[PDB]
Design a protein around this ligand. Structure first.
Ligand SMILES: [Mg+2]
Ligand SMILES: [Mg+2]
Ligand SMILES: [Mg+2]
Ligand SMILES: [Mg+2]
Ligand SMILES: [Mg+2]
Ligand SMILES: [Mg+2]
Ligand SMILES: [Mg+2]
Ligand SMILES: [Mg+2]
Ligand SMILES: [Mg+2]
Ligand SMILES: [Mg+2]
Ligand SMILES: [Mg+2]
Ligand SMILES: [Mg+2]
Ligand SMILES: [Mg+2]
Ligand SMILES: [Mg+2]
Ligand SMILES: [Mg+2]
Ligand SMILES: [Mg+2]
Ligand SMILES: [Mg+2]
Ligand SMILES: [Mg+2]
Ligand SMILES: [Mg+2]
Ligand SMILES: [Mg+2]
Ligand SMILES: [Mg+2]
Ligand SMILES: [Mg+2]
Ligand SMILES: [Mg+2]
Lengths: 83, 153, 128, 115, 101, 100, 211
RNA sequence: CGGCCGGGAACUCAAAGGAGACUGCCAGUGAUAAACUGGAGGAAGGUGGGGAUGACGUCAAGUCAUCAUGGCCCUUACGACCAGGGCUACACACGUGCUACAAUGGCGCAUACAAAGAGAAGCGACCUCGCGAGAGCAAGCGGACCUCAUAAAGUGCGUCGUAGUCCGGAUUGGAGUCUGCAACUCGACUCCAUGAAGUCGGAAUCGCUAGUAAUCGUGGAUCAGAAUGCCACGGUGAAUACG
């Protein structure tokens, strides 16, 4: 857990993208590689294609997701089963 | 050792009793090199045993030890291709060591709470010849008599 | 007066003993013998040389010991008292030797060796 | 000796017996007894009912038992619903805190199942 | 006059002994009172490295650097002594540190 | 190692001494107890704009003769093979095999 | 089995160090890098000057190199031209004012490094390896070495299968710590690959120690 | 009433140089020999203890991914860089370890005794705040001086009284701290809550002959952060060897 002094960490490209998207009002998915950025209230109600290392997975962010990080909703490994 | 005939290491006598036998008993009881704890246990057990069963700690300890000492044990020789269980007389120092070892292990097994209490109970029971240690001695003697037929191999 | 001195040594401990012809007082690092050594065996080991060549109530000794543990310090104190007694009398050498107090026990430790988990404890081996 | 709707052993001391409440451990039991004014050594038995009522009122200040179990279940169920990595691990039945799963995950995975 | 303290550090011990001998000879000849050379404890910095190129973990080399110290204290210095000691340059590989005051 | 891995290293040392002061200055305001949301947020957002190889912790010690990324002693700036080879040739002043 | 380095096992006892300077841990690694650079450059330059042992000695603000060589005439050349060139280059490499001294080896047949270098030179020039190694052993023994051993290894005569061949004359006690075993190695980069040459020369035993 | 300060070089200690141990002396066995067994002195006795030191060679043993290097191969790609991911997966099998199954113990209070090391983009005290991990201020110190740094087992008193327990700590939920551009995948640590299996483990199998095994803590390298591994240090300290 990041210290409370420093505050939550989120990436600039995603920030301009989300503020510009908030200002614009468009609903195109936001392609990002910033899995380490925490989710904010202004991001609520947006589709964000987070990179899983292979492809961009669309995550429709909701109010409950605030405080979590984008990577948590973009699983990287793909395991079905051994048998 | 194939080629070595050095004897046994000199052991110092018990501080509070001046008994080499008692010192060996403390060493056998001791675990993890914690001699202080084992020495306190044996001293308390000896005092309790003395008060209960007789006059002095050494007298009670020796009578119990004698009641546990084995005359003859059995080893596994291998001469005729198969293994023969043959009886063999035990040298006196091994008698003392086996007796003390049997007493300690029997005391550990017992279900009483304190270790000193278990040791005192087992020592008194061995003196009275109803203990697990004397049972172990009688068992080894019984098996030796059973396979005494191979006493000349 | 004379302040007969003796240096005792044990695995890592070093004791300095000053014997004086007085009563039977023992002062170890500005403490009584019972205060310093809670171990009854340690107390008796410190006693041992005096009891053998009877001087228990005839000598004051002032002791300072550094390093080691309880048994090591007790052994160093015993060695120092023996050396001080030998220097003081010089007739007790034979009695002290036959008791076994003059000899300095040289067993310190075996160092840990590369490849072994301890000085001699070897890692567990497997055939398959 | 019934606090928060569960029976509490009487022969035990107050500190240890209090821990039998789901949601009260060692430190919390010590704090409850300190606030109440009851000594730790004194056993649950031979306690005046007024002190036991004081203990009940003190315990009421913590979310302990059924309610606490409901809260924990709600948290886990919320993780499941969110569909995050922790929720996925919870529903799969695998170690959540990033422990190795190649070996030594038998607390979550239960006993071994032969192939 | 405040005293001057000199700390000599070397990897070789006989070299440092010869070096401190030269220093004490100079200072004692020129009148000032030498207080030393006190042998301070040596630093044994030990290292352990793998000798096999690929895989042999138990095959290792254990190395060490041993640093010897010598403390030479000069009290009541005279002007002749202080200039002479600066005039004298010692053998290389012997680190000298002159702390004064 | 590869001549490119060694080239990458020399790049994380120059970028790190270039942007040493700003980083420290930015970290000060980012850690300072008497800062502000507008200040700490702005300094924390500026730190994550700097050239990345500017951070020290993105540098890894490697032999100063081979570039070996493993087994590197700091007092020898060397790995585990080269130290031994140099020690045997009597090149590391005061290096002797121990036998305590 | 695997044998220990004869020079490394005898450092301090009978053999001196090549680099002889003190440094704190702050400047130790940088000193090592500079010493490596200096030795590399000096060997590369005076490959054809039969250089035996470069000895680096650092005053607190100076670098003193001592080149032990068989033929001082070629390394110094005309008056001081070549030594000054080497001095200025080593000064820029080190970053410190430099001073170069040259020690003449009167017996290049007893120096293990020189003997090994000559054998590798002959091997590169495509002589017979047995002929070269026998010549070296005979020369050393004639000059009066108490013993000498020479070993060559790897694709001898361009053979597909590698072999090791070694010749010893006199005694060369490796396990005797007080012995004076001069040891060095070299590599001949022949057209069929690398051929390793090792040379031991037992010059005597030093009773006094003398570090 | 602190070696703290006058002082003292007595003692510990710090290194540097020396002395000492050689079956040297005595007796016995013996081939009239080498040697062996005892014992006198001696701190040490029979290689005093430990380490380093690894003969000729064996296994076409291992390493072309340290390196060097013969041949072969790629050259707008087999090379170059960037972001994300992975090397941390998980039906399972094997190996090496750590913690336990408890009373020779757990917990609480009081209290004693080490050695060896590291430290400048570092070790960081005192004091203040925080339940704590830690934070703020900040002396000192390239260090027998200052810091890491309180050794633990032990000792004394109390309690628990043989329970799946005041044993055991896995797992999980919540809240945090610090390092670091950045702790989702995938860090360490702290607090509260939770409290799996486990009651000494079949066949089989491993290590160890003495300050050893067993047990108890401490340090270092690697390292921004990240050891139950590795390498060192000391405390307590056995049993047995007929053959
Ligand atoms: Mg004797
Ligand atoms: Mg140990
Ligand atoms: Mg290359
Ligand atoms: Mg080897
Ligand atoms: Mg006074
Ligand atoms: Mg003898
Ligand atoms: Mg040898
Ligand atoms: Mg091969
Ligand atoms: Mg092969
Ligand atoms: Mg193999
Ligand atoms: Mg990449
Ligand atoms: Mg792997
Ligand atoms: Mg993992
Ligand atoms: Mg208890
Ligand atoms: Mg240091
Ligand atoms: Mg607080
Ligand atoms: Mg528990
Ligand atoms: Mg908890
Ligand atoms: Mg079950
Ligand atoms: Mg149970
Ligand atoms: Mg680290
Ligand atoms: Mg470290
Ligand atoms: Mg351990």
């Amino acid at each position: 857990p990041r210290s409370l002094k420093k505050g939550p960490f989120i990436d600039l490209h995603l920030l301009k993208k989300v503020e510009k998207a908030v200002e614009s009002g468009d609903k195109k998915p936001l392609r990002t590689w910033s899995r380490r950025s925490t989710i904010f209230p202004n991001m609520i109600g947006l589709t964000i294609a987070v990179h899983n290392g292979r492809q961009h997975v669309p995550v429709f962010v909701t109010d409950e997701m605030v405080g979590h990080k984008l990577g948590e909703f973009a699983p990287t490994r793909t395991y079905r089963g051994h048998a | 050792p194939r080629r070595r005939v050095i004897g046994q290491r000199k052991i110092l006598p018990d501080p509070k009793f001046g008994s080499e036998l008692l010192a060996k008993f403390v060493n056998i009881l001791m675990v993890d090199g914690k001699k202080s704890t084992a020495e306190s246990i044996v001293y308390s057990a000896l005092e309790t045993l003395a008060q209960r069963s007789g006059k002095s700690e050494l007298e009670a300890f020796e009578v119990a030890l004698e009641n546990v000492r084995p005359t003859v044990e059995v080893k596994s020789r291998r001469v005729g291709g198969s293994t023969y269980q043959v009886p063999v007389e035990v040298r006196p120092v091994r008698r003392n060591a086996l007796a003390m070892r049997w007493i300690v292990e029997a005391a550990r097994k017992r279900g009483d709470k304190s270790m000193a209490l278990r040791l005192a109970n087992e020592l008194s029971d061995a003196a009275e010849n109803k203990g697990t240690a004397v049972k172990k001695r009688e068992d080894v003697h019984r098996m030796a008599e059973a396979n005494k037929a191979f006493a000349h191999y | 007066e004379n302040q007969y001195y003796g240096t005792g040594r044990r695995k890592s401990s070093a004791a300095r003993v000053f014997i004086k012809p007085g009563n039977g007082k023992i002062v170890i690092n500005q403490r009584s013998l019972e205060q310093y050594f809670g171990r009854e065996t340690a107390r008796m080991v410190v006693r041992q040389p005096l009891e053998l060549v009877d001087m228990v109530e005839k000598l004051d000794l002032y002791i300072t010991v550094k390093g080691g543990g309880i048994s090591g310090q007790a052994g160093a104190i015993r060695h120092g008292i023996t050396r001080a007694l030998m220097e003081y009398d010089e007739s007790l050498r034979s009695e002290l030797r036959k008791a076994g107090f003059v000899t300095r026990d040289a067993r310190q430790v075996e160092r840990k060796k590369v490849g072994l988990r301890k000085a001699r404890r070897r890692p567990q081996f497997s055939k398959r | 000796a019934r606090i928060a709707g569960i029976n509490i052993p009487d022969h035990k001391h107050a500190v240890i017996a209090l821990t039998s409440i789901y949601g009260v451990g060692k430190t919390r039991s010590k704090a409850i007894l300190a606030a109440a004014g009851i000594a730790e050594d004194v056993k649950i038995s031979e306690l005046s009912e007024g002190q036991i009522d004081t203990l009940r009122d003190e315990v009421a200040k913590f979310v302990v038992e059924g309610d606490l179990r409901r809260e924990i279940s709600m948290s886990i169920k919320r993780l499941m619903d969110l569909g995050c990595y922790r929720g996925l691990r919870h529903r799969r039945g695998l170690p959540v805190r990033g422990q190795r799963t190649k070996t030594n995950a038998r607390t979550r995975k239960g006993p071994r199942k032969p192939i | 006059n405040q005293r001057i303290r000199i700390r000599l550090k070397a990897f070789d011990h006989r070299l440092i002994d010869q070096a401190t001998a030269e220093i004490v000879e100079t200072a004692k000849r020129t009148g000032a009172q030498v207080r030393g050379p006190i042998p301070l404890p040596t630093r044994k910095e030990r290292f352990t490295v793998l000798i096999s190129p690929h895989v042999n973990k138990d095959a290792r080399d254990q190395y060490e650097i041993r640093t010897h110290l010598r403390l030479v204290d000069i009290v009541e210095p005279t002007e002749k002594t202080v200039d002479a000691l600066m005039r004298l340059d010692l053998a290389a590989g012997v680190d000298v540190q002159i702390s004064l005051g | 190692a590869k001549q490119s891995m060694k080239a990458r290293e020399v790049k994380r040392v120059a970028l790190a001494d270039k942007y040493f002061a700003k980083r420290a200055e930015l970290k000060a305001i980012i850690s300072d107890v008497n800062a502000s949301d507008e200040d700490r947020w702005n300094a924390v957002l500026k730190l994550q704009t700097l050239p990345r190889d500017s951070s020290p912790s993105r540098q890894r010690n490697r032999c100063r003769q081979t570039g070996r990324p493993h087994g590197f002693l700091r007092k020898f700036g060397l790995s585990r093979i080269k130290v031994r080879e140099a020690a045997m040739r009597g090149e590391i002043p005061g290096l002797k095999k121990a036998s305590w | 089995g695997q044998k220990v380095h004869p020079n490394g096992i005898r450092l301090g006892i009978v053999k001196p160090w090549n680099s002889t300077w003190f440094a704190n841990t702050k400047e130790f690694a940088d000193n090592l890098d500079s010493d490596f650079k200096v030795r590399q450059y000096l060997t590369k330059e005076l490959a054809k000057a039969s250089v035996s042992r470069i000895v680096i000695e650092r005053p607190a603000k100076s670098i003193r190199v001592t080149i032990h060589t068989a033929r001082p005439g070629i390394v110094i050349g005309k008056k001081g031209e070549d030594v000054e060139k080497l001095r200025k280059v080593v000064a820029d490499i080190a970053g410190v004012p430099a001073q170069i001294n040259i020690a003449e080896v009167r017996k290049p047949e007893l120096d293990a490094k020189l003997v090994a270098d000559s054998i590798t030179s002959q091997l590169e020039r495509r002589v017979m390896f047995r002929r070269a190694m026998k010549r070296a052993v005979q020369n050393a023994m004639r000059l009066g070495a108490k013993g000498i051993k020479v070993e060559v290894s790897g694709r001898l005569g361009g053979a597909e299968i590698a072999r090791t061949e070694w010749y010893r004359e006199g005694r060369v006690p490796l396990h005797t710590l007080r012995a004076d075993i001069d040891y060095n190695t070299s590599e001949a980069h022949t057209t069929y690959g690398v051929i390793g040459v090792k040379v031991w020369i037992f010059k005597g035993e030093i009773l006094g120690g003398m570090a």
